[PDB]
Amino acid sequence: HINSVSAMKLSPYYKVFEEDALSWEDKLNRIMALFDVWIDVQRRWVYLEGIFTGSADIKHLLPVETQRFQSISTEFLALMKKVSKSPLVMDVLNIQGVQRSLERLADLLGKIQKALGEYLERERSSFPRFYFVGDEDLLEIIGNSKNVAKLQKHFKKMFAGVSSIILNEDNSVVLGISSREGEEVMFKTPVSI
Amino acid sequence: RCYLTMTQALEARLGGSPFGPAGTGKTESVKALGHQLGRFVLVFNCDETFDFQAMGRIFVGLCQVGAWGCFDEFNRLEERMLSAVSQQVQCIQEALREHSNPITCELLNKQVKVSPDMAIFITMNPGYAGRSNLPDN
Amino acid sequence: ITSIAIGSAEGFNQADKAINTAVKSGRWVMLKNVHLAPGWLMQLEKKLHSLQPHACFRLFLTMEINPKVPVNLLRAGRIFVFEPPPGVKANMLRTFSSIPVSRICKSPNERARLYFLLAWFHAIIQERLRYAPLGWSKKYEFGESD
Amino acid sequence: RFNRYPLIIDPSGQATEFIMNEYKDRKITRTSFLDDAFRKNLESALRFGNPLLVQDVESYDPVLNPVLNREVRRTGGRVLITLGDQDIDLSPSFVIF
Amino acid sequence: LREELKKVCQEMYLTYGDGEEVGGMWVEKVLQLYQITQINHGLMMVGPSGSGKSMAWRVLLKALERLEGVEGVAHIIDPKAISKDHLYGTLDPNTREWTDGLFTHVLRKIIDSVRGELQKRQWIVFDGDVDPEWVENLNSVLDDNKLLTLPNGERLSLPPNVRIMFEVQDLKYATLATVSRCGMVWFSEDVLSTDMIFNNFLARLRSIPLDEASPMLQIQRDAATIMQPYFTSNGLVTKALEHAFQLEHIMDLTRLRCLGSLFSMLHQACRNVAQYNANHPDFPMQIEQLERYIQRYLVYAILWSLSGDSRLKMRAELGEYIRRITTVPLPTAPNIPIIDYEVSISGEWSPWQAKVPQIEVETHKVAAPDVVVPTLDTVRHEALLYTWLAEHKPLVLCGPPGSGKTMTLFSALRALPDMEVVGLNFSSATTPELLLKTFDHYCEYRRTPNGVVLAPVQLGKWLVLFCDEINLPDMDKYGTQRVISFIRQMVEHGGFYRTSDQTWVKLERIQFVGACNPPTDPGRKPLSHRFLRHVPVVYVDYPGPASLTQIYGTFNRAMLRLIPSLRTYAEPLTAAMVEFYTMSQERFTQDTQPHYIYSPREMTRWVRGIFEALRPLETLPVEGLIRIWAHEALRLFQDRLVEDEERRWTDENIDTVALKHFPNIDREKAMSRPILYSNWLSKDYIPVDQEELRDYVKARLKVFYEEELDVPLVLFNEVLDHVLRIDRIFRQPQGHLLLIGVSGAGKTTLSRFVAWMNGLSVYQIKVHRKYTGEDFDEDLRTVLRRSGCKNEKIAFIMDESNVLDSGFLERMNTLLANGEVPGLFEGDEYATLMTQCKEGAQKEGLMLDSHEELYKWFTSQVIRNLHVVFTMNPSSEGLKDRAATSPALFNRCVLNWFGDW
Amino acid sequence: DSGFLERMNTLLANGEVPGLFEGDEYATLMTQCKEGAQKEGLMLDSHE
Ligand SMILES: Nc1ncnc2c1ncn2[C@@H]1O[C@H](COP(=O)(O)OP(=O)(O)OP(=O)(O)O)[C@@H](O)[C@H]1O
Ligand SMILES: Nc1ncnc2c1ncn2[C@@H]1O[C@H](COP(=O)(O)OP(=O)(O)O)[C@@H](O)[C@H]1O
Ligand SMILES: Nc1ncnc2c1ncn2[C@@H]1O[C@H](COP(=O)(O)OP(=O)(O)O)[C@@H](O)[C@H]1O
Ligand SMILES: Nc1ncnc2c1ncn2[C@@H]1O[C@H](COP(=O)(O)OP(=O)(O)O)[C@@H](O)[C@H]1O
Ligand SMILES: [Mg+2]
Ligand SMILES: [Mg+2]
Secondary structure (H helix, E strand, O other): OOOHHHHHOOOOOOOOOHHHHHHHHHHHHHHHHHHHHHHHHHHHHHHHHHHHHOOOOOHHHHHHHHHHHHHOOOOOOOOHHHHHHHOOOHHHOOOOOOOHHHHHHHHHHHHHHHHHHHHHHHHHHHHHHHHHOOOHHHHHHOOOOOOOOOOHHHHHHHOOOOOEEOOOOOEEEEEEEEEEOOEEEEEEEEEEE | OOHHHHHHHHOOOOOEEOEOOOOOOHHHHHHHHHHOHHHHHHHHEOOOOOOHHHHHHHHHHHHOOOOEEEEEEEHHHOHHHHHHHHHHHHHHHHHHHHHHHHOOOEEEEEEEEOOOOOOEEEEEEEOOOOOOOOOOO | OOOEOOHHHHHHHHHHHHHHHHHOOOHHHEOOHHHHHHHHHHHHHHHHHHHOOOOOOOOEOOOOOOOOOHHHHHOOOOOOOOOOOOOOOHHHHHHHHOOOOHHHHHOOOOHHHHHHHHHHHHHHHHHHHHHOOOOOOOOOOOOOOO | OOOOOOOOOOOOOOHHHHHHOOOOOOOEEEOOOOHHHHHHHHHHHHHOOOOEEEEEEHHHHHHHHHHHHOOOOOOOOOEEEEEEEEEEEOOOOOOOO | HHHHHHHHHHHHOOOOOOOOOOOOOHHHEEEEEEHHHOOOOOOEEEOOOOOHHHHHHHHHHHHHHHHHOOOOOOEOOOOOOOOOOHHHHHEEEOOOOOEEOOHHHHHHHHOOOOOOHHOOOEEEEEEOOOOOOOOOHHHHHHHHOOOOEEEOOEEOOOOOEEEEEEEEOOOOOOOOOHHOOOEEOOOOEEEEEEOHHHHHHHHHHHHOOOOOHHHHHHHHHHHHHHHHHHHHOOOOHHHHHHHOOOOOOOOOHHHHHHHHHHHHHHHHHHHHHHHHHHHHHOOOOOOHHHHHHHHHHHHHHHHHHHOOOOHHHHHHHHHHHHHHHHHOOOOOOOOOOHHHEEEEEOOOEEOOOOOOOOOOOOOOOOOOOOOOOOOHHHHHHHHHHHHHHOOOOOEEEEEOEEEEHHHHHHHHHHHOOOOOEEEEEEEEEOOHHHHHHHHHHHHHEOOOOOOOEEEEEEOOEEEEEEEEEOOOOOOOOOOOOOHHHHHHHHHOOOEEEEEOOEEEEEEOEEEEEEEEOOOOOOOOOOHHHHHHHOOOOOEEEOHHHHHHHHHHHHHHHHHHHOOOOOOOOHHHHHHHHHHHHHHHHHHHHHOOOOOOOOOHHHHHHHHHHHHHHHHOOOOOHHHHHHHHHHHHHHHHOOOOOOOHHHHHHHHHHHHHHHHHOOOOHHHHOOOOOEEEEEEEOOOOOOEEEEHHHHHHHHHHHHHHHOOOOOOOOOOOOOHHHHHHHHHHOOOOOEEEEEEEEEEOOOOOHHHHHHHHHHHEEEEEOOOOOOOHHHHHHHHHHHHHHHOOOOOOOOOEEEOOOOOOOHHHHHHHHHHHHOOOOOOOOHHHHHHHHHHHHHHHHHHOOOOOOHHHHHHHHHHHHHHHHEEEEEEEEOOOHHHHHHHHHHHHHHHOEEEEEEEOO | HHHHHHHHHHHHHHHHHHHHOOOOOHHHHHHHHHHHHHHHHHOOOOOO
């Protein structure tokens, strides 16, 4: 829609619809920016919530970080409820202060993310293959432990020929491993999730 | 000849150091030997920014996994970092000899377990760009 | 003994702590490849001159032949030059001094003869290295490791 | 008989112990340019008129430049010397080696 | 793919060839590039500058887009415009945390593919120089491993949709390891044709009007139609270019530089036609008049664009070659060349000498820096500079120091009210950080839907960054200047990458002007051909004797108006000044001593000295005029000399020139052995003798002992002369001092005594152990606050032992050159400075709004009040190093050679 | 005078004096407080 508005801007009779089209392209630009921020903040929050929920004794060793994450997750869930109350995309755009709230929430999620490498080093010590995985990808792996489909792209970093694993339809049994071109090895005894 | 020399180095619990000009098949030969022996081979394009702490961290990861580490252009690490890394290499080789005979040795002032399957390989070209000289130790 | 390889900040701290402990107690301490830190060798010589050590304490520190090595430390220390030994006799004497008698005397009796043959071959190739570039095309590094 | 303060080149320390023995009634504190307690030792020597022997002159501190030039202010009946940011009353019986 | 290539070449105003036509070689190179892109993931396009590599890969991207439907994204990284740490990333020694670099960030974003990056065709193009410092990290990426290995153990695999391309001018410093990995496409200079470039320029003239159907369109199409026969085949431009490649230029001549220069000239011609039509609405532009105007403007434009950087003899040779070879109506001129003739809007040749007559400047601003005496070369260069600046095209001013490059740019700027000039002085240790600090001070970063835009604070205003010493920044071991690569990236690609977030920044209203010395000078280096392609260069030589005599005769006549008895002694005085300057310049050269540079700046300071001596007097004989002339000659031609034989040569030749030009004068009353001048004994700057001056100076030291410094001194005539010179420099505005002599010779003490005489506060940085650049910046901030906010005159005494690294002398160079240091006051410091400057303006009585005018007032106050005295020991290598690293120490500082006793 | 004691009363009651830090003093205080919070180890956003 942005490309088509830009196309009708140039020619032939843009002067009639200029007043409406300028405001409409401004609306499209701001909604594009809003959802660009939103996708990043949602991707941050999903694995951050996974890490701060599944793992235990995090508040005992990282109390201020856990408290700040709870404080920002409360307003994130408030925005969840507000967006569910008004599911229209235009209404979400017309929510007051949503852009600056998202920018501030992105900054706080990034800071809390950057303040977690001390906890990540213990996980790297626990699983030795995690030493070849970056901080972002390790946080994604830990936060998506209950959601094992995003982990598929991370097996290439920490394995030689294993690029993906074979999973059951219940997402609780690992049937085997796979290579990057279709070759697969079926396990004798599958593990349980 | 590469396989014979590097397996002699492995049985002597020493690292392997193939050297020569570019395009002679050094990194690929190391990877081929590692794949024939069935090991996970990690290839590192090392730099002058490869800190002592960073090298120790990749050493502890490699030791805990039990994987092979190929360091291509190893003479780019600078003289003093290279001399400092020599101590970690010596400690890892001592741990490997101890395993040959809870087998751990200290790296980065911490106790880290060492696996028998790991190895250190370095690949270099002498005088590629006025690179560093390896200390005798 | 404590052996430290010079070239890192952790190495400098470890060398300082080991030197202080060896002065306090009386153990030996070593720190190698010192030609990479001449500015640190300056204050090392200064603190070694200032400090009064234990009666049984030796500080060994190795370097290559380098003009960057400070003159004050080079004058305060005791200098030993470790070059390849000129002569087949000198090479064999160094070889037999290096080889432990217990290891060379293990059964069977031909182990010592094989060690002597290796010593002769090593002396010949090292002297040929000395007679470059006609003994060998390049200056190879044949030594105690080989 | 020096006018400018002396720099002693002694590879043996005999002149150093000679100076320490010469100024014994006037107590020398022995300091080095690389010590942390050099600025306060120099300030105390300047204030109290004590002889001072500073070693390791190869790592010379340029804070000694006004002292070596004898840059002296005489505002009032007060004789002053500037050592860094602070201002110190210079004692007449001060000598540095 | 050939049909799609033809379509996008039609869209992009590019010439397509079927295989035997003009574009066949270029199309074949595009097809070969496509084949190597198929069979390899590591790629290099190698060839000389202006060969078609960029257009080849861009047209291939567009053709593949329109073929396969997948849309291609290109990431253009200059690997040399930034540091390797910013290119790849760092591990912080304090906290073990990894920050991504530019290439690492781009690759990681593609791998993550949050916005669907893996489904697109991604091409990462490295547009810059190649050395093993940064590409041996890409060895493993360009190998079959396809892994980017980082020091923290985080390895990044290369997805199959990503191609890594290098667009390099040459591979002089590339190793066989790097060469073996990448497939090579060799673009020769014959692949891209001047016929292709002419076709592109003509098509862009037919379309895409200059004013951002229309009369501008019609003017452009008519001009293109009438200049069409001169571009195709051999014609005129190709033969002129072929001849101009045989002439000797200062900068290395390239085809694309001259061609883009000529294209900008012709665009300005079309704009001139449009302006004429706007001026005359009743009478439109006649086609015959347009033909006559364009046919002459084209010859004028090719002459200037092909021999602007040559000397007068070579541009005359090019003009006579054109007159011999082309059938174009040219003015009937037996001796005067075509380069002295302009093209009027009516379509006829006009002399340049008819533009400006003889001027009579008023005696108040008789020789002020803002005053320019108009000459032939002056008006020609002003016209050329205005033509370059009108299209906001970057330019380079080249020539010997003091030849008038800065004032010509300022005079051309004064004809453009919509532009602002910010002065930057380059040094050996000049990085893009200087440009970034200038952007931080004078511009703001604005976030737009299309991207991040950097624009000046002044809306509707164009910012001109004037870089003074572009030749001087250091080349690395592999022949690259980082700031030159940065400027080339900002000129060609229209922006740069922000380091903080790896985000592309686009420039909106920002242009660049560069001054430089010829690259054969000891500190200077030749500029890269890729950068030099985008910048036309004009050579500004010295005026010469016939120009200098009238330039400074105007000043002599204008300042010899207060008294009518000496108005007849103006032409011989000017002749004597010109002759002595010529002999001094011929005698003392840079091959003897690094600081032996003589220029019209010394003549300007000569006129300044004579005028400021003649202001408060209002009666003086010829003997007194000759005495002040000789005193100014001494102070401007002996103070920098090292050898006593040179000093006595200058004294004897001053006597010879004065006696040659002023016969029948009192030799004793005009020439004296001491010859000193002072304003201490009286209220005016009148001559003094040694004895009473020595008595006065003895009394002043007697007072000075109990007030500031109780160090007794022994006087002599050298001491008296030295303190008089320091007094003169302290009286002059923006008077910076450079004293060369042995230590303990009494330089800082004499400077402190003269500062106490003149009421100047003395500041010393008090350097000690572990003294850092942060401490130096704090001391500089305190000095600048006291000098520019509290209206305090400060004599800033600095020693060569106080300089500890390159940052000290870089900040000092900027301060000496401009009176301001961009980036010195940031954040809370800048806010406190702004409040202090507002209070100071209130105290001074000036009423000032905003922060820009307040900062300009602060800079003016610092220029007025701050005097910097530099003290250092004589050494050949030391002098050469300081000349290379701080040009302001030898351009803005008056050098007095104290020497040994 | 009472101007001293009003400020002292507010300081004793609340631990803060509104209007005491104004202009560039507030900016300098904010920078120093950010540095102090970083040294203590807490992570704090904005000025409130
Ligand atoms: N096929 C073409 N037809 C017409 N003009 C062309 C064609 N290819 C290139 N040009 C012109 O040549 C100019 C210079 O070519 P190009 O931009 O490709 O430079 P390059 O070879 O990448 O040089 P550099 O090494 O300086 O980056 C372009 O600005 C364009 O106007
Ligand atoms: N024995 C071999 N058989 C097949 N290909 C080889 C062999 N040895 C080397 N090569 C090829 O030659 C190239 C050399 O690459 P590499 O091993 O990195 O050499 P170097 O380490 O000396 O740069 C590789 O691409 C590899 O595929
Ligand atoms: N026609 C002229 N009219 C007035 N001044 C001139 C003329 N030609 C040369 N000058 C003098 O030449 C000097 C050149 O100085 P400047 O342009 O600042 O240095 P650069 O040429 O290195 O940029 C100026 O001081 C100026 O006074
Ligand atoms: N004309 C003079 N008469 C007596 N002493 C002098 C004279 N000039 C310099 N000095 C001595 O030099 C010292 C300071 O020199 P200084 O001004 O620092 O020289 P520089 O600036 O060249 O290092 C003073 O202590 C003073 O005694
Ligand atoms: Mg290799
Ligand atoms: Mg290009």
